[PDB]
Amino acid sequence: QVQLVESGGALVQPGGSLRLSCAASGFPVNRYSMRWYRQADTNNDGWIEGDELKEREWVAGMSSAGDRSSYEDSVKGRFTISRDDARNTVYLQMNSLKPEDTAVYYCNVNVGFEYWGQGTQVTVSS
Numbered sequence: 028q029v030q031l032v033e034s035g036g037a038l039v040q041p042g043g044s045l046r047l048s049c050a051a052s053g054f055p056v057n058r059y060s061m062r063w064y065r066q067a068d069t070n071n072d073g074w075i076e077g078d079e080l081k082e083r084e085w086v087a088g089m090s091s092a093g094d095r096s097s098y099e100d101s102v103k104g105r106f107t108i109s110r111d112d113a114r115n116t117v118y119l120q121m122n123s124l125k126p127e128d129t130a131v132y133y134c135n136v137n138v139g140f141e142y143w144g145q146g147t148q149v150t151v152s153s
């Protein structure tokens with residue numbers, strides 16, 4: 028069936044870089060637009076909990092043909108979305124990471140229903 032599996036989350040120092048992956052099963056990533064979302068840690072405790080789990084912040088997206096990408100303002104220039112069609116995987120490159128980027132990151136596709144993966148956490152902290 029349709030499945031999305033995020034990986035690559037880690038603890039990173041401020042200013043650091045990371046690449047997240049979203050491995051898709053059940054459909055081809057080069058036939059669907061794919062998006063990254065996050066649920067951020069808004070109370071600076073290093074956890075995503077409670078009302079933080081009721082949020083839906085769009086981070087980045089790329090079109091099915093691969094020729095149109097978009098980013099939320101707060102990450103423009105710092106993050107880059109790409110994909111590897113052979114690995115059926117979408118990536119999110121992060122640079123110049125900030126504490127405000129601490130969040131669980133989720134990839135998303137619409138295959139006749141709206142689907143999100145189980146998420147991977149990035150923590151930006153000292």
Ligand SMILES: [Tb+3]
Binds near residue numbers: 069073079
């Ligand atoms: Tb929290």
